[PDB]
Amino acid sequence: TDGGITSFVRTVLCEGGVPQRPVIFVTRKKLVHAIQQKLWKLNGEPGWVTIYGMAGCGKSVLAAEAVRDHSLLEGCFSGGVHWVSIGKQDKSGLLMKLQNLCMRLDQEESFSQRLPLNIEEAKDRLRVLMLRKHPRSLLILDDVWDPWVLKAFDNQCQILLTTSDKSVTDSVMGPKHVVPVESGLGREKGLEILSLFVNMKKEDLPAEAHSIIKECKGSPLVVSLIGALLRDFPNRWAYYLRQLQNKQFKRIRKSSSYDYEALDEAMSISVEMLREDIKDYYTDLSILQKDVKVPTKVLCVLWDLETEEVEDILQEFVNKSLLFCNRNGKSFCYYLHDLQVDFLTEKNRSQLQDLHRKMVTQFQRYYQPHTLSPDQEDCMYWYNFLAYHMASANMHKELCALMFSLDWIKAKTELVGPAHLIHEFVAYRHILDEKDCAVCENFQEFLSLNGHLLGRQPFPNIVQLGLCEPETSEVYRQAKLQAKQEGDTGRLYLEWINKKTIKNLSRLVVRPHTDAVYHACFSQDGQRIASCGADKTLQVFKAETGEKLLDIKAHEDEVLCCAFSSDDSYIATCSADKKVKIWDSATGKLVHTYDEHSEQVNCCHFTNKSNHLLLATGSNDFFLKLWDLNQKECRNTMFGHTNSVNHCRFSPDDELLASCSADGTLRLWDVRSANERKSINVKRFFDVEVIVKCCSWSADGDKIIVAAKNKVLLFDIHTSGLLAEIHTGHHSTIQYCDFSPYDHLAVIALSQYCVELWNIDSRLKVADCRGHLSWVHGVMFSPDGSSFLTASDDQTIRVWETKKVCKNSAIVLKQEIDVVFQENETMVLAVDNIRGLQLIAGKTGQIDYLPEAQVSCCCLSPHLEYVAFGDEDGAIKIIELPNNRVFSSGVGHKKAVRHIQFTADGKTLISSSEDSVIQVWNWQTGDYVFLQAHQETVKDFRLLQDSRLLSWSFDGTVKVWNVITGRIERDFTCHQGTVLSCAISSDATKFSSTSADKTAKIWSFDLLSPLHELKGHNGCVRCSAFSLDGILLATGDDNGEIRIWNVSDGQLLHSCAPISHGGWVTDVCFSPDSKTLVSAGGYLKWWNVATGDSSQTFYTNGTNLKKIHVSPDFRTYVTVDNLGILYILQVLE
């Protein structure tokens, strides 16, 4: 103990969070130095310096002592250092840490306020602060337990960590180091310690001394404790050597309590010796977890006291070495050494349940769940713990109360993401949602859809998000009320009338994981399913009710795949720990481990015949191993692939093995010999690298389908020729699939949550499957094919019954519709997503179908009665609804049919395609009128006043034909490149402006020169509309920007163009009162004329809407999201 401090060393250390010294200290300079060395030994280059040793051996004090020296600090870590007590944390745990470490580094919000909402995101926010804003800085990680934790800090920093297990640096690369520190200490120091406690100096240090130390085993913790004991009772020097002689502490799990023995005792005694008023107090601290620092106030609420007092009490403890503390900024938070917690949790074992109940109670006596203003030192603590303490005390009532609250949901999420709350619902399900009620799934399924939104600022109106749930759901009832309680307060909540029609309600959803499900598969009999994922476990349920049958902790890392044996006897799993495990489908006990791959493993599949039993695995080691489960060893290793092997199914007839790699080849192996028999290069792409995944065999096993980027391919296992090729969603990437045994059906996981299954051979999508809203990973048919399952990042497996998903539902449509706000009801007409078109009667499902050659656009005749639609080949037809059959079809049109529309009167159809000619079919009579623009390709038109019709194209040209006489009454060359949207001033029509690539020029059907150009928009005005007379015209920009310009020929009224919109502002429209501008693009969003927005609410599952249909009164709406969801909104009662 002395002084090498510099009031600088101070700042740098008190800043970063480094702890100070322990009451009494003994310069272990020999190692303070040992460590320091390895630190300079990093130079500039980032590295890893690990100070490991048995728990309670000094490390944490050693670390601090290392960076407690100016010489080493400046010129090395001149930027500073940051202490981060991590300890043993699960996933959600490390998150609360990182969240903290960020609330500290960007304490200036220098890079967006609000903390990161998840590990990954925090990794970055971190990597930035360390590599700028705080460079040349050291990161001190106190007590690390798992390798993976280090890989999150692997961001070019020089990190000094401490651990009780050196093997934590095997999941990270860099010039690592090691500074071994024994578990014990040396008598001379141990003595020093005692000495400095009793105020002696080895001179008066009794005989016992040398023996006591020998008993405390050197552990500075143990010693110091005893030393604090021998100091508070100067006589028992030999009395205690006696207690320590024989460890009279009795804990369950006697067996081999390593470091305990000496410690448990030290504690046992000192504790029993506390005064009889503060002794009850220390007992309560039995509910404070390892590597968790509590703040003064958390205790005030527990004990009904105040700062000073609560601090004095706890002081007596820190002084006696029964507690620890460090600054937080005038405010103090105290921790407990790991071992001391294990002590207490064992000692006051039978009392733990009550302490967690005495807490919470003391939290309701002072606070409110949804009233914790985020300035209270204790704030955080509660959010990420109140929910735990309650469960940790088993309080069905209490808990359900806090987690079934819309208000807590908001409250918490806005502060720390939904990341935690999501875990919790799953963790505390066992106690939470009991009885019969599924008031859970509701809140659970709630946290899945709108997951992405919560915690993301501008914070969503948690009420609307709820209104969007099933009527039956509690999330709704709580949101319906929350609303009806404020009736008339300038808000107005919209309401999804047909919220019911949508929702492909799968026959069953299962939630058994804490993290993304990466795979699943039915048992041969189809009765069960196994599903492994990043929750590091295996999980097997009934294909019936999801009734859990097995909950194994499979591996010590993420699990990339799993499958059942040929007779459902075993379930094997293979992961990134490079291990392949076989389990007992029955007992679920380990049955054997095959560790031979160099890299992670992915494909693991059993032989199909109930005769022989083998297992084939693919890895990133490029090999493919065949295991003979009846042998302690591997049966083969297929050297062959160029890159990583991904998928691989055994041919029905167990003689061939298929292999699908990243090297762009499909490869057939002869099981018996294990020799490459064929290799199929996938070259359908435009040297280029392509990855082939999912790849199943056909019934007869004389064919095989495989998936590469944006296609599925059917190959003849013989000719090695290609039999069929179906392209998928424009441009994405099939992430998985699975050939069905019957009907040529093949389900495929498209890019992100969208999952559609097709019908090869007819090569036509058969049915879309909107179900998840979080990246889908796996998907496959039950053996018999009757049904299929899906696994995604929303960490849920959902069974689906095939027959039912394929029926022609009006659930999902294309984004080509036409609305009819006929008063007492809204009527939408939409192009189906598969074949015909649907006549939807919003406010009474009533879905009527109409077969057809895959239309390309729809069209309703005001009065209904006649429905018209364009076609893909340019064909046009009209069908009369009353009859719903007799249809009339005119001839014309070379390209597909875009906008098509009926004339004011019941006859004459206008329709533009993808070329210069507009068409005016005055059907019924049969006469035709053409409008040879000679232009380029009419972008779109609009039925003007009296038989006059405004047109515009990729020529900046706008025109005013007149039907019944293809005669150009007006021509304008008002843009040098593609006109995009432009409206008329409806009332009268004195004006009619445009908006092309640049800005929006508004003119007057007269002056063959635009009134005043409206420059500014830095994206490209892609729409606009005039204010129902009101003298205003809003222009929707491309990057979300949206300015409202004023009808005074040329100005620049307010630009309420936030984004801090969501990609493209494809539409707008003013209220009949010229006060409410409602925009549409990535999602709906209203505004307040002249500065500020409004009910910016309503977010849709999907996005990139196009045209938002507003009824007359602005109290009814209709739109469709790129997920085929038809939203028919209508303001709340």
Ligand SMILES: Nc1ncnc2c1ncn2[C@@H]1O[C@H](COP(=O)(O)OP(=O)(O)O)[C@@H](O)[C@H]1O
């Ligand atoms: N050099 C030292 N001098 C005095 N006491 C020490 C010393 N090192 C550790 N201790 C005692 O042990 C505690 C710190 O233990 P710690 O270093 O955090 O264990 P670990 O290294 O396994 O994390 C302190 O409360 C202190 O009384």
